[PDB]
């Protein structure tokens, strides 16, 4: 599963670097160049989504009220609820990833940094499991970079 590996690599690095400010220097791996451009597209579009919709996102975060490990469960089920809908497009996908980064920042502030990687895997698992066909047809993360050129 190369799509899953690449998706996790992109989403995990974005969430961690958004939460800590630290960039991960380790090599990518297979299809490394496309992942680096996806991540650059993600910083550009995703940082913007977070800035331009901080009020809405914070109200959403407030609803989830995340103060402990068990609260962290609710986050994946929101992901499942969306991706279980039949509609698929890159705007939904980048928006859910961006909300993941917003919640990752929170988790760091609440001394739950160890929860960020599981959060990233849950996002990746749901995205790839539920939308594999659609993603494949866009040429995976190459379509993402080209859609947001």
């Amino acid at each position: 599963d190369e799509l899953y590996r690449q998706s996790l690599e992109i989403i995990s690095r974005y969430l961690r670097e958004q939460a800590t400010g630290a960039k991960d220097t380790k090599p990518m791996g297979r299809s490394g160049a496309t992942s680096r451009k996806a991540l650059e597209t993600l910083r550009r579009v995703g940082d913007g989504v977070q800035r331009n919709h901080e009020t809405a996102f914070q109200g959403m975060l407030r609803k989830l009220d995340i103060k402990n490990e068990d609260d962290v469960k609710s986050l994946s089920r929101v992901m499942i609820h969306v991706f279980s809908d039949g509609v698929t497009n890159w705007g939904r996908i980048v928006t859910l990833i961006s909300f993941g980064a917003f919640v990752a920042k929170h988790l760091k502030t609440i001394n739950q940094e160890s929860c960020i990687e599981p959060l990233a895997e849950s996002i990746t698992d749901v995205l790839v499991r539920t939308k594999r066909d659609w993603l494949v047809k866009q040429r995976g993360w190459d379509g993402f970079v080209e859609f947001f050129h």
Binding site: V45, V49, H53, A56, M60, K63, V78, H81, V82, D85, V87, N89, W90, G91, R92, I93, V94, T95, L96, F99, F147, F148
Partner: peptide, 19 residues
């Protein structure tokens, strides 16, 4: 109806870049 607010926001963002 949080779910529906996120979907709605994502569809907005999709429309903007599809133009």
């Amino acid at each position: 109806w949080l779910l529906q607010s996120l979907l709605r926001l994502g569809d907005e963002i999709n429309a903007y870049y599809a133009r």
